[PDB]
RNA sequence: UUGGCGGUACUUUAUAUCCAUCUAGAGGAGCCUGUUCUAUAAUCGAUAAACCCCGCUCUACCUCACCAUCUCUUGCUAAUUCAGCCUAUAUACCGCCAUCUUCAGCAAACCCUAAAAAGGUAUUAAAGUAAGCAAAAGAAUCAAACAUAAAAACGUUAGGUCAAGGUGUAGCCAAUGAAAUGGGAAGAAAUGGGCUACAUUUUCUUAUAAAAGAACAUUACUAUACCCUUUAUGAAACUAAAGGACUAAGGAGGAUUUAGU
């Protein structure tokens, strides 16, 4: 009562033919695009396939691909025994020959260190590989209990005296922690025809966008869209929003700003200018100050934007009245 | 049969529930004023706000006056709950009630709130005054 | 919210960032180093390092705003402060040297001391038990106690005023009359406390 | 309109109404209307070279044509005959043989078990059903779910036989599960001279008592209908058996195989005691027949012969030899088994 | 529950093709469009007429090749040219396909007054994406 | 021996969540609109949650299916003792959906048991294993995140829809079909939703939401009704818009209830 076909297992003979067909494919794709077959590479292949078979499907897994068989197929679906039927690995009948073969090596290392007999922080800012990464190294499915047990054994190895061989071993299972630098990207300092220094930066609040041009030396003259700021912004709260960047760094009356804000309303345009001024003013302040701006909210774009209306309800969140029952 | 026995793996209600609640509170208060239940339970010096028996009679809920310290209350909770099964035994054995429901211990922090209000209230500014099953189709060749 | 939970509220205190490193408590010192590896929310449109920004008054402005009309609500509060300053200047000039000392002409200090005089220590939460309404004495938090003072002021002026009077003229007359502990809002606080006394026995319920 | 016309797959889905509120919680039959249609054949009878007629005939390139009114009527009638003939084929069926009754599954052959993992065919094995229970159980899917428990037996008629229980929601699935499970539990049953058990067998499996007796050739299978079914699978041709107590089919099947697989062959008895096993047939006179000789060393101590044996006798067996009248139901004329 | 263009789950024995497996919300994500014309682009006219021609062209091809279509046809319009790309099972003899192509091309070229070409890719049997 | 069952509590978990807290509403007035009722010669369907500005992103004729009157009888097509039918059954169905629901489950192939009515977990591991569908992931809102959409199986409600279309069974065929003209009315009624107002954080005017000058309780605020003019579409104004006066009620709404993180 089974019609669903067996999950396909790939013989080494099958993958071997898939690699000869791919190798002949590269020579043909190279001949089509007029490139040299010897130097034709995986990057050139992907670019050629995108030109010859343009697909605009959003998901990239569904687009045409001519990749090396090692990539498209799973890495190790090969037979685990020979013609006679004798498995190749002495731990085959465990069902996790690769997980237990690794736990066999690390347990033997631990025993030699304990029998044979400094700071253990040889590597810092590193993490243990996640289960998904481990499963990729072993090429076999692991459970959470199997991963948890593997880490405990690796930790015990670090606790004990470790020669350079052990340190290299544990290194394989340590992945450098991603380094996201939460530090503002300082803008360059250009020079005008007059020779005065000035920096420029963009800012976006709601639908408003601004392009400020702060000058290193000035008397505090801010011009928005070729107008003064008291005229352009008759509301105090809009002017206070322009005061926040300079007042915070005690730099009032020391710079000359030229703004160009298009889009949005009065408050959204002041907010867009505030960010544009804070980002341009970074080039003329110390790095310790740039961090004080970043930590006071002056350098982060505000992500709050109007939410779309939903069909079947009065608003983005407002619902139609629940008729009286 | 000891192992088998002790493994144990497998308007009427309104007036009745105003007597069981009063009596159970009267009885459990006496149980906790002596080391009879345990020495740990005697030293906790626990007080009982009230007892509430469910309408189904599934459980008997005993409200005990919680204290200020969470650690003191967390300890008291564990000790009281562990002995609740034993406390029920003692009430059936002294013949307080023939049938007693599983005892559950609920916290009563209300006594702290009332003390707080009186503190503020004194300090407040009041102001101046068959066909398919059968082989017939199989044996006829239809299938 | 469009801010992931990892984002941190911005700190807009000018003196705090410029303090000497040694003057900062190690707890505060730790947070600064930690925040260097965190995400910071963008500052609100009404959040500035201005020396004239008072959080209490800014909150009072938002509780008067209707339909997102902040310009009008801020204008009414600005007119109120001026109406209170002008009412004390007249009294100060028309008073003897001895009386002049007591008279307070700072509107920001009359506003804060007015609200504080209208804050109720205890509250009343209405409950229904056995088909009747038994409201019982309750204790109020610092947030609930402040909200009630502001709400009671904005509601006395909005409703119990003549038709042709304006909010800057009724609110000014109440901040000053509350500042002396004689206004109707103060009576609202007194009535709350006196009812709680009456319901002392019903606190158990 | 030509644009309101739907395909056959959608038309039959609606008309049959198989998926519906009534169907699931409580007859129309599907037909294929393109079965006999040959591309290029229409009511008008046109002949299209390269589609419904030869493109070239006797070296002549054909042209379009139309059949005469008489010729087309013949073709129309011929197709009507083929449709009626096809319908007659659908009506015609090959009836299978019943078991112990016409409406019961007991005794019904369901074929050999399926091939094994490496093309291990079992065409020499036959499968027989012994009990089929249709029981409704309680599960959240439908409140009360349905289940079919089927006990089967398998055997090659040459000493190898086995039984298994298969359960499923569908009867077909229970048949498959039981049939392939039983091929993994094959007992080998020892038959004396290929037609009977080596000796009398009496046993009680739970509350089911079985009492088998070794019989001469031509005696046939005078046993419970379920024992006849299994004995044919095992290959026993002549035996008597009586079943008493409970008639539970599983206890009778388990108890039968338990006794038949624990029986002592003559060679085993010769090896255990070291003596010759001799057979005396009344149709061969006093002639001693040697049926088993000890494999190792023949003993010289005669087996002790008691004056009066202490055997425990069954009243049912002895009662007959005591001259007591049997029931009217005993030893009736029955068809060859 | 949504019932639109969803080939519902059976018991693992139903062979669905790639096109049938994917529900409507996967259009432009995992599966493309069966017809490609310029009539639904912004500031373009004659969407109604191009769509009506497509409906007919699909019903015509099903009836002209009854039981011989492995998957839905793909219609491609360039200038006034129409191109029909159909996956067809290898059931009919080879010469019969040449007849239906010559017939279906000429008939649809004189009916819509455009050059129409038929492109047939023959498969040994329907291609099964998954068993559902 | 399984399942079911509770009007079962305690403990966690979360919920614009029962209650509590917060904001603007509904419930009162005037209107717009759906429904029920009354009622008409005069449709139909939805009508607890999950109907009630619902099929309609829409009814002056048309639309139209209704009522009255008159008229046609091979009466759209190549052919057909045929065409045609908004005739009955959504309790025969397809199609396309609602509801629990962004709830976490549904289904099949094997293996095991001193027999199985069933069950099958122990991680320092004791019989379970390996594939599906949903969730998850991925993709979309054109950096990034978050959020929002989309997605959401099997079942539950014989839930909705024979009137989108198609269709099983039964029924009409000088009529239950086709076509033309004229009509399809109203309410001292109840009720759902929406709109506007009840004003001073207001009204009018210029600018523009900045500021300024006036108005500010008897019609001051205040009619998207009625009535009267003019313009727009149309063949037809019975429709819509703009003025004009006329102006009544309304003074922030009892229990109760809706939405929002
Ligand atoms: K349906
Ligand atoms: Mg809104
Ligand atoms: Mg019979
Ligand atoms: Mg009409
Ligand atoms: Mg009409
Ligand atoms: Mg009709
Ligand atoms: Mg239904
Ligand atoms: Mg209905
Ligand atoms: Mg994405
Ligand atoms: Mg998902
Ligand atoms: Mg129904
Ligand atoms: Mg008619
Ligand atoms: Mg204004
Ligand atoms: Mg006109």
In a mutagenesis test of the C interface, which of B110, B115, B126 is the best target, namely the one with the most C β-carbons within 10 Å? B126
Helix (H, G, I), strand (E, B) or coil at A119: coil
Long-range contacts of E68-72 (CB under 8 A, 24+ apart): E68/E92, E70/E123, E70/E125, E70/E126, E70/E127, E71/E17, E71/E19, E71/E126, E71/E127, E72/E19, E72/E34
With contact defined as beta carbons under 8 Å apart, do A294 and C8 qualify?
Answer: no
Flag whether C touches B (3+ CB pairs, 8 A cutoff): yes
Task: List C-alpha distances in Å: C163 to C175, C183, D178, D180.
Answer: 20, 20, 93, 95
Which bound ligand lies closest to the C-alpha atom of D22? Answer: 7
| Chains in touch with C (≥3 Cβ pairs < 8 A) | A, B
Relative to beta strand D201-205, strand D277-279 is unpaired
Q: How many CB atoms lie within 10 A of CB A266?
A: 15
With beta carbons under 8 A apart, name residues in chain B contacting C197. Answer: 121, 124, 126
Residue E96 sits at the chain D interface (C-beta within 8 Å): yes
CB-based contact, D169 to chain A, within 8 Å = no
Residue of A nearest to C51 (CA): A247
What the block records as the tokens of E86 is 């159909």
Q: CA-CA distances (angstroms) from residue E78 to A289, B70, E56, E112, E113?
A: 62, 79, 18, 14, 14
Which residues partner with D57 through β-bridges? D60
- CA-CA distances (angstroms) from residue D114 to C16, D125, D181? 83, 10, 10
Identify the residue whose Cα has the smallest distance to the C1' of F210.
Answer: A234
CA proximity to A303, closest of A208, A204, A210, A202? A204
Pairing of strands D126-139, D109-111: antiparallel
For residue E29 the two structure tokens come to 């994500």
From D172's Cα to the closest Cα of chain A, the distance in A is 9
> What torsion do the CA atoms of A291, A296, A301, A307 make, to the nearest 10 degrees?
150
Q: E117: buried, middle or exposed (CB in 10 Å: 19+, 13-18, 0-12)?
A: middle
Q: Does E32 touch chain A (CB under 8 A)?
A: yes
Two structure tokens written together for B81: 């709950």
Contact criterion met (CB below 8 Å) for A63 and E30: no
Q: Does E120 touch chain D (CB under 8 A)?
A: no
Q: Which residues pair with E82 in a beta bridge?
A: E77, E116
- d(CA D61, CA D72) in angstroms, rounded, equals 23
Question: Which residues on neighbouring strands pair with residue C125, listed in sequence order?
Answer: C136
Place of tokens 């610092």: C142
In DSSP terms, D243 is beta-bridged to: D210
CA–CA separation, D170 and D163 (whole Å): 20
Buried b (16+ CB within 10 A) or exposed e, C7-27: beebbbebeebeeeeeeeeee
Residue C159's nearest nucleotide, by CA–C1', is F252
Straight-line distance from CA E11 to C1' F28, in Å? 61
Handedness of CA C19, C21, C25, C30 (dihedral sign): positive
Nearest alpha carbon to residue A157 among A144, A142, A174: A174
Task: Say how far apart CA A49 and CA E27 lie, in whole Å.
Answer: 22
Residues in contact with D192: Cβ distance below 8 Å, sequence separation at least 6, in sequence order: D198, D214, D265, D266
Q: Is there contact between B and D if contact means ≥3 C-beta pairs under 8 Å?
A: yes
A81 CA from centroid of ligand 7 (Å): 58
Nearest to B126 among C137, C194, C200 (CB): C194
Q: What technique was this entry resolved by?
A: cryo-EM
- Spatial distance from the CA of A143 to the C1' of F221 (Å): 75
Strand ranges for chain A from DSSP E: 126-128, 174-176, 190-191, 197-205, 208-215, 222-224, 227-228, 257-259, 261-262
Pairing relationship of beta strands C39-40 and C122-129 according to DSSP bridges: unpaired
Q: CA D201 → C1' F120, Å?
A: 37
Query: Nearest Cα to B84, choosing from B54, B66, B106?
Result: B106
DSSP per-residue string spanning D143-183: EEEEEEEEEEEEE-SSSEEEEEEEEESSHHHHHHHHHHHHT
Q: Return the ∠ at Cα C34 (arms to C31 and C40), rounded to 5°.
A: 90
Chain-centroid distance of CA A261 in Å reads 31
The secondary structure of D53-72 as a DSSP string is B-SEETTEE---EE--HHHH
CA gap B33, B45 in Å, rounded:
8
* Residues constituting chain B: 143
**Residue B141: count of CB within 10 angstroms of its CB:** 11
Q: Between residues 109 and 138 of chain B, which touch chain C (CB distance below 8 Å)?
A: 110, 113-114, 116-118, 120-121, 123-127
CB-CB neighbors (< 8 A) of E6 in chain D: none
How far apart, in whole angstroms, are the C-alpha atoms of residue E121 and residue E86? 6
Q: How many CB atoms lie within 10 A of CB B76?
A: 21
Closest CA to D50 of A299, B99, C23, E92: E92
CB neighbours of residue D108 within 10 Å: 22
- Tokens 């069902």 belong to which residue? A95
d(CA A182, CA A203): 18
Residue C147 C-alpha to ligand 13 middle, in angstroms? 29
CA A241 from centre of chain: 33
Largest CA distance in chain B: 105
Q: Which residue has the tokens 């019904």?
A: D108
Listing DSSP states for B6-26 in one string gives HH----HHHHHTTTHHHHHHH
Burial of A275 (0-12, 13-18, 19+ CB in 10 A): buried
Min CA distance, D55 vs chain E (Å)?
9
Sort out which chain B residues have CB atoms less than 8 A from D105's CB and list them. Answer: 135
Give the angle subtended at the CA of D235 by the CAs of D234 and D239, to the nearest 5°: 100
How many angstroms is it from A23 CA to the middle of ligand 11? 64
- Partners of residue A57 in chain E, C-beta under 8 Å: 28-32
Name the pairing type of β-strands A222-224 and A227-228.
Answer: antiparallel
The full 3-state SS of chain C, as one line of letters, equals CCCCCCEECCCCCHHHHHCCHHHCCHHHHHHHHHHCCCEECCCCCCCCCCCCCCHHHHHHHHHHCCCCCHHHHHHHHHHHHHHHHHHHHHHHHCCCHHHHHHCCCCHHHHHHHHHHHCCCCEEEEEEEECCEEEEEEEECCHHHHHHHHHHHHHHHHHHCCCCCCCHHHHHHHHHHHHHCCCCHHHHHHHHHHHHHHHCCHHHCC
Return the closest nucleotide (C1') to the Cα of D25: F158
Instruction: Considering only the beta carbons, identify the residue of C35, C43, C49 that sits closest to A247.
Output: C49
Which strands make up the sheet holding D221-222, listed edge to edge? D201-205, D208-214, D239-245, D221-222
Separation in Å, CA of C193 to nearest CA in chain B: 6
Compute the distance from residue A59 Cα to the ligand 9 centre, in Å.
Answer: 10
**Probe site for chain D from A1, A3, A85 (most D CB atoms < 10 A):** A1
A62·E15 Cβ contact <8 A: no
* CB contact at 8 A, D150 and D132: yes
Q: How many CB atoms lie within 10 A of CB A239?
A: 15
Q: How far apart are CA A239 and CA A225, in angstroms?
A: 15
- Structure-token pair, residue E1: 């529950």
The set of strand F positions with any atom below 7 Å of a protein CB reads 1-4, 6-11, 19-25, 48-53, 91-100, 105-112, 115-118, 123-125, 130-133, 138-140, 143-159, 165-168, 191-194, 199-202, 209-211, 216-217, 257-261
Residue of A nearest to D176 (CA): A1
CA distances, E13 to each of A9, A309, C55, D294, E16 (Å): 20, 42, 68, 61, 9
- Tell me, what DSSP letter sits at residue E26? G
Residues 6+ apart with CB under 8 A from E56: D2, D3
Q: Which of B116, B118, B126 sits opposite C193 (nearest CB)?
A: B126
D55–E95 CB contact, under 8 Å: yes
Do the strands D143-155 and D160-168 form a parallel or antiparallel pair, or are they unpaired? antiparallel
Which of C36, C44, C49 comes nearest A291 by C-beta?
C36
Tracing tokens 């994500």 back to the chain, one arrives at E29
SS (H, E, C) E31-49: ECCCEECCCCCCCCCCHHH
Inspect the interface and report whether the beta carbons of B121 and C197 lie closer than 8 Å: yes
Q: What's D200's DSSP letter?
A: -
């Amino acid at each position: 009562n089974v019609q669903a076909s067996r999950q396909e297992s790939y013989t080494e003979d099958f993958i071997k033919k898939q690699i000869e067909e791919f190798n002949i494919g590269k020579r043909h794709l190279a001949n089509m695009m007029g490139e040299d077959p010897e130097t034709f590479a995986e990057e050139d292949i992907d670019r050629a396939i995108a030109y010859l078979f343009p697909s605009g499907l959003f998901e990239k897994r569904a687009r045409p691909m001519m990749k090396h068989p090692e990539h498209i197929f799973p890495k190790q679906r090969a037979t685990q025994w020979g013609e006679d039927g004798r498995p190749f690995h002495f731990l085959f009948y465990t069902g996790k020959q690769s997980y237990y073969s690794l736990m066999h090596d690390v347990y033997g290392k631990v025993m030699q260190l304990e029998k044979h007999r400094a700071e253990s922080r040889d590597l810092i800012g590193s993490r243990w590989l996640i289960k998904e990464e481990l499963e990729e190294m072993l090429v076999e499915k692991l459970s959470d209990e199997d991963y948890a047990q593997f880490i405990r054994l690796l930790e015990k190895l670090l606790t004990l005296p470790c020669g350079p061989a052990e340190e290299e071993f544990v290194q394989r299972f340590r992945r450098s922690v991603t380094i996201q630098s939460k530090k503002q990207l300082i803008e360059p300092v250009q020079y005008d025809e007059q020779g005065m220094a000035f920096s420029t930066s963009e800012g976006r609040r709601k639908s408003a966008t601004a392009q400020a041009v702060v000058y290193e030396h000035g008397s505090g003259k801010i011009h928005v869209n070729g107008v003064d700021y008291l005229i352009y912004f008759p509301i105090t709260q809009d002017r206070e929003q322009l005061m926040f960047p300079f007042h915070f760094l005690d730099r009032l009356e020391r710079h000359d700003v030229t703004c160009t804000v298009s889009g949005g309303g009065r408050s959204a345009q002041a907010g867009a200018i505030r960010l544009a001024m804070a980002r341009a003013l970074c080039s003329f302040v110390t790095e310790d100050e740039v961090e004080w701006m970043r930590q006071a909210g002056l350098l982060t774009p505000d992500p709050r934007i109007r939410e779309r209306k939903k069909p079947g309800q009065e608003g983005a969140r407002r619902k139609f009245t629940w008729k009286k029952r | 049969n000891l192992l088998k026995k002790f493994a144990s793996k497998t308007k009427e209600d309104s007036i009745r529930l105003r007597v069981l609640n009063g009596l159970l509170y009267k009885s459990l208060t006496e149980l906790l004023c002596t080391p009879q239940v345990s020495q740990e339970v005697y030293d906790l010096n626990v007080e009982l706000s009230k007892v509430s028996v469910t309408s189904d009679f599934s459980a008997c809920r005993v409200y005990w006056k919680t204290g200020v310290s969470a650690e003191q209350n967390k300890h008291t909770e564990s000790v009281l709950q562990r002995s609740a099964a034993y406390m029920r035994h003692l009430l059936i054995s002294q013949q307080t009630l023939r049938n007693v429901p599983p005892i559950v211990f609920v916290q009563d922090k209300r006594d702290l709130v009332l003390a707080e209000v009186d503190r503020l209230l004194a300090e407040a500014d009041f102001g101046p005054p068959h066909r398919d099953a059968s082989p017939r189709s199989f044996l006829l060749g239809e299938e | 919210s469009r801010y992931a939970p990892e984002f941190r509220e911005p700190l807009i205190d000018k003196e705090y960032y410029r303090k000497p490193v040694a003057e900062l408590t190690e707890e505060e010192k730790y947070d600064q180093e930690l925040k260097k590896t965190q995400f910071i929310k963008a500052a609100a449109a009404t959040e500035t390092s201005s020396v004239f920004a008072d959080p209490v008054i800014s909150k009072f402005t938002n509780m008067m705003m209707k339909g997102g009309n902040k310009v009008l609500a801020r204008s009414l509060m600005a007119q109120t402060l001026e109406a209170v300053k002008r009412k004390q200047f007249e009294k100060y000039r028309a008073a003897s040297a001895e009386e002049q000392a007591t008279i307070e002409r700072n509107p920001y200090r009359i506003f804060h001391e007015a609200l504080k005089n209208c804050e109720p220590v205890i509250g009343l939460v209405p409950i229904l038990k056995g088909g009747h309404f038994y409201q019982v004495p309750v204790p109020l938090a610092d947030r609930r106690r402040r909200f009630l003072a502001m709400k009671w002021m904005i509601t006395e002026c909005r409703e119990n005023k003549p038709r042709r009077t304006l909010m800057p003229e009724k609110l000014s007359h109440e901040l000053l009359e509350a500042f002396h502990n004689r206004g109707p809002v103060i009576k609202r606080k007194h009535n709350m406390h006196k009812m709680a006394e009456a319901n002392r026995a019903l606190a158990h319920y | 309109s030509f644009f309101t016309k739907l395909t056959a797959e959608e038309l039959w889905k609606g008309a049959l109404a198989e998926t519906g509120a009534g169907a699931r919680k409580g007859k129309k039959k599907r037909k294929d209307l393109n079965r006999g249609q040959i591309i290029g054949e229409g009511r008008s009878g046109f002949l299209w070279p390269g589609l419904n007629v030869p493109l070239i005939k006797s070296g002549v390139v054909q042209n379009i044509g139309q059949r005469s009114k008489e010729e087309q009527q013949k073709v129309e009638a011929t197709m009507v005959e083929q449709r009626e003939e096809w319908d007659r084929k659908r009506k015609i069926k090959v009836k299978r043989e019943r078991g112990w009754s016409g409406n019961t599954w007991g005794g019904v052959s369901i074929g050999p078990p399926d091939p094994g993992p490496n093309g291990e065919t079992y065409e020499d094995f036959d499968t027989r059903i012994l009990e089929v229970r249709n029981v409704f159980n309680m599960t959240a899917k439908e409140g009360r779910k349905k289940s079919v428990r089927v006990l089967v037996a398998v055997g090659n008629g040459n000493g190898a036989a086995g039984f298994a229980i298969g359960k499923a929601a569908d009867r077909g699935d229970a048949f498959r599960k039981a049939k392939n499970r039983a091929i993994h539990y094959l007992h080998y049953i020892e038959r004396y001279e290929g037609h009977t058990i080596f000796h009398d067998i009496s046993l009680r499996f739970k509350r089911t008592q079985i009492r088998m007796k070794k019989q001469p050739r031509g005696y046939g299978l005078r046993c419970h209908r379920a024992i006849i079914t299994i004995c044919r699978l095992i290959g026993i041709k002549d035996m008597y058996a009586r079943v008493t107590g409970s008639m539970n089919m599983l206890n009778l099947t388990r108890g039968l195989f338990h006794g038949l697989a624990r029986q002592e062959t003559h060679q085993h008895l010769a090896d255990k005691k070291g003596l010759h096993v001799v057979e005396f047939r009344e149709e061969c006179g006093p002639l001693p027949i040697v049926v088993a000789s000890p494999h190792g060393a023949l003993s010289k101590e005669p087996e002790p012969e008691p004056e009066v044996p202490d055997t425990k006798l069954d009243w049912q067996d002895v009662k007959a030899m005591q001259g007591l009248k049997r029931s009217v139901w005993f030893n009736l004329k029955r068809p060859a088994t | 529950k949504n019932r639109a263009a969803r080939v519902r789950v059976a018991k693992g024995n139903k062979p669905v093709s790639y096109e049938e497996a994917h529900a409507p919300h996967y259009i432009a994500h995992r599966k493309g469009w069966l017809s490609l014309h310029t009539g639904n682009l912004d500031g373009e006219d004659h969407a109604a007429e191009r769509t009506l021609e497509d409906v007919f062209l699909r019903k015509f091809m099903m009836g002209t090749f009854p039981g011989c279509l492995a998957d839905q046809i793909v219609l491609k319009r360039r200038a006034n040219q129409v191109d029909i790309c159909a996956l067809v099972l290898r059931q009919l003899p080879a010469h019969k396909f040449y007849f239906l192509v010559g017939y279906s091309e000429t008939l649809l070229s004189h009916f819509y007054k455009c050059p129409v070409r038929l492109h047939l890719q023959t498969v040994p049997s329907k291609v099964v994406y998954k068993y559902i």
